[PDB]
Amino acid sequence: ELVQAVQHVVIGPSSLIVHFNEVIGRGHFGCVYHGTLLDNDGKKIHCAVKSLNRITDIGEVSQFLTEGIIMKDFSHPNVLSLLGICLRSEGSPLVVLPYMKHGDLRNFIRNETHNPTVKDLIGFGLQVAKGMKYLASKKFVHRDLAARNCMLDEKFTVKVADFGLARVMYDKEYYSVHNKTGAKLPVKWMALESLQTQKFTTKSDVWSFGVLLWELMTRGAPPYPDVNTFDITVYLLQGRRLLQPEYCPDPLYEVMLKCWHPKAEMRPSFSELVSRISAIFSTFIG
Ligand SMILES: C[C@@H](c1cccc(-c2c[nH]cn2)c1)n1cc(-c2cccc3cn[nH]c23)c(=O)[nH]c1=O
């Protein structure tokens, strides 16, 4: 049943050549490698192969196939596509993604050799909002939305993605898995109710999106640098937020304040964020 359903997601050695010698990135989930996908005509597609080195038991493997079925359906220009999954008889399972020429958004904006304007940064955030509006229409909760998980392709199109631990189905398993592997929770990106109740919704993704807008307007600065991870909840309960960046227009900072509304039901939806940020974006010349 799950096996029959996941077949269209599986790719194998008849199409994929993983270059285990060419490492793109090292993480808590395993490594990312350069890959080559040859289609039926014979043409080459450059890709990134994420290895999920911790998935071993029946319950982990079955949750992974379920996630592949969900993520294989994704088709939106601001959402990183899933090319397929490798279910090898030997070796850890692999996730095959399209290769992103300019890396992750945080690295791109933090690099001293790159000089993006304020309009470019607002535009990058507008692309993330469009990608999240699509995810939210599928009832897909990100849980880890941050500038480090937004990729930039050869055309400077932002793709919403995740380069962390394997995705789980239940919020109870999300904390359980982070504690079992020593991977830190993305505390400074979590909504107040997520920090206190351990649950995640699309409204808590809207909170993380506000932090991502703040990362873009500061060119990759760490949020709440002087606030300890364990002091974040009291800081937020006191009504304190991230301060308005130096080159951030007043209407954009108002949008961030609405994302960080203590009442989750009062935050804007991603559809409202797309409408609001397009209006702000158009007033910027260039
Ligand atoms: C398609 C893409 C993607 C696009 C937009 C949002 C998200 C997201 C939000 N919150 C968690 N993920 C993921 N994607 C998919 C996988 C993936 C593929 C197949 C199976 C599993 C099991 N876990 N992850 C799997 C991956 O590793 N990385 C990645 O970038």
Domains of the chain: 1-98 (3.30.200.20), 103-283 (1.10.510.10)
Nearest alpha-carbon partner for 85 in 100, 110, 63? 63
User: Could you tell me if the CB of 144 is within 6 A of ligand 1?
Assistant: yes
Closest CA to 22 of 46, 58, 3, 56: 46
Q: Which atom of ligand 1 is nearest to the CA of 63?
A: 22
Choose, from 41, 73, 104, 144, the residue flagged as catalytic: 144
Locate breaks in the chain with C to N over 2.5 A; list the residue preceding each.
Answer: none
Euclidean distance between CA atoms 104 and 199, whole angstroms: 27
Joined together, the tokens standing for residue 261 give 């509304």
What CA–CA distance (Å, rounded) separates 140 from 207? Answer: 15
To the question of whether residue 26 is assigned a binding role by annotation, the answer is yes
Q: Rounded distance, CA 138 to CA 121, Å? A: 26
Residues with Cβ within 8 Å of 100's Cβ and at least 6 positions away in sequence, in order, are 48, 80, 151, 152, 153, 159
**Which experimental approach was used here?**
X-ray
Sign for the pseudo-dihedral over CA of 98, 101, 106, 107: positive
Cβ–ligand 1 distance for 67 under 6 Å, the answer: yes
DSSP 77-107: TTBPPP-EEE--SSS--EEEEE--TT-BHHH
How many angstroms does the Cα of residue 120 sit away from the middle of ligand 1? 26
Would you say the CB of residue 104 lies under 6 angstroms from ligand 1?
no
